[PDB]
Design a protein around this ligand. Structure first.
Ligand SMILES: *[C@@H]1O[C@H](CO[C@@H]2O[C@@H](C)[C@@H](O)[C@@H](O)[C@@H]2O)[C@@H](O[C@@H]2O[C@H](CO)[C@@H](O)[C@H](O)[C@H]2NC(C)=O)[C@H](O)[C@H]1NC(C)=O
Ligand SMILES: *[C@@H]1O[C@H](CO[C@@H]2O[C@@H](C)[C@@H](O)[C@@H](O)[C@@H]2O)[C@@H](O[C@@H]2O[C@H](CO)[C@@H](O)[C@H](O)[C@H]2NC(C)=O)[C@H](O)[C@H]1NC(C)=O
Ligand SMILES: [Br-]
Ligand SMILES: [Br-]
Length: 218
């Protein structure tokens, strides 16, 4: 997250960190005790058997007892286009079930087909890079963003910070976009670099896949 702020500890108990060898590489969302939701390109060209799904985290630099770690058991993709970044969504079933508590909770999804209009205020978040060679973020970052439809494809939900250069960046992929308490987006890609100030950030549209999601997580 470039130009954002530190989130309050465990403010978003659905927020997940995908890690390889102790290193965060993507975000994800706990959509059920044994299912998370992330971007298909976050698990593309990686060893999924080595991916660790870390729940209930806040500060990645400390070993926090609030954490619950899981592995990937099953992979679900529905037409992910790696060249055009279409349907950049993957549902990952975990090797177990999370214990629901103050720090680990299931998120709420919108209704199938619900589309957000221009101007809606949303909140992005992630452990991605902080910006200009600043490096990765240890504590969870969040960012107030505004939905925009111009310079955006219908197969994406796009957001833009008005008045200043800020947005998602490397390491934020797969992280959720929260609008009105619902997960409407999965961080997918940026244009013109991070915090370009010109090109909106692009999220995979969670609403377009709810029926598919529901069919898998019952
Ligand atoms: C579900 O999986 C987790 C994760 O296991 C680690 O991550 C995988 C990618 C792979 O490297 C596995 O070999 C690893 O075990 C399990 O977490 C471990 O639990 C053991 C015993 O309780 C503990 O010693 C380890 O520290 C844990 N590993 C962590 C936290 O990374 C977890 O036990 C599995 N749960 C079930 C129900 O199978
Ligand atoms: C900056 O964003 C916060 C958070 O946005 C709200 O909550 C998110 C989880 C998501 O659902 C967004 O769509 C929401 O807009 C804004 O916080 C709310 O602010 C109102 C007062 O304006 C307050 O009554 C609520 O309690 C706040 N909700 C929180 C903190 O969760 C905040 O207003 C935004 N600020 C600016 C300057 O845009
Ligand atoms: Br901020
Ligand atoms: Br930080």
């Amino acid at each position: 997250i470039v130009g954002g702020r530190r989130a309050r500890p465990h403010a978003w108990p659905f927020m997940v960190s995908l890690q390889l060898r102790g290193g965060h590489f993507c975000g994800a969302t706990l959509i059920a005790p044994n299912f998370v939701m992330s971007a298909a390109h976050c698990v593309a060209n990686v060893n999924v058997r080595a991916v660790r799904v870390v729940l209930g985290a806040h500060n990645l630099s400390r070993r926090e007892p609030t954490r619950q770690v899981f592995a990937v058991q099953r992979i679900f993709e529905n037409g992910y286009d790696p060249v055009n970044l279409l349907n950049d969504i993957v549902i990952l079933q975990l090797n177990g079930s999370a214990t629901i508590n103050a720090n680990v909770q299931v998120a709420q999804l919108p209704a199938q087909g619900r589309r957000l209009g221009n101007g809606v205020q949303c909140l992005a978040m992630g452990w991605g890079l902080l910006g200009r060679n600043r490096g990765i973020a240890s504590v969870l970052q969040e960012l107030n963003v505004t939905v925009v439809t111009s310079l955006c494809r219908r197969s994406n939900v796009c957001t833009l910070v008005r008045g200043r250069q800020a947005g998602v960046c490397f390491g934020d992929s797969g992280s959720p976009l929260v609008c009105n308490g619902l997960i409407h987006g999965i961080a997918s890609f940026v244009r013109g670099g991070c915090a370009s100030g010109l090109y909106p950030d692009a999220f995979a549209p969670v609403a377009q896949f709810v029926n598919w999601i529901d069919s898998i997580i019952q």
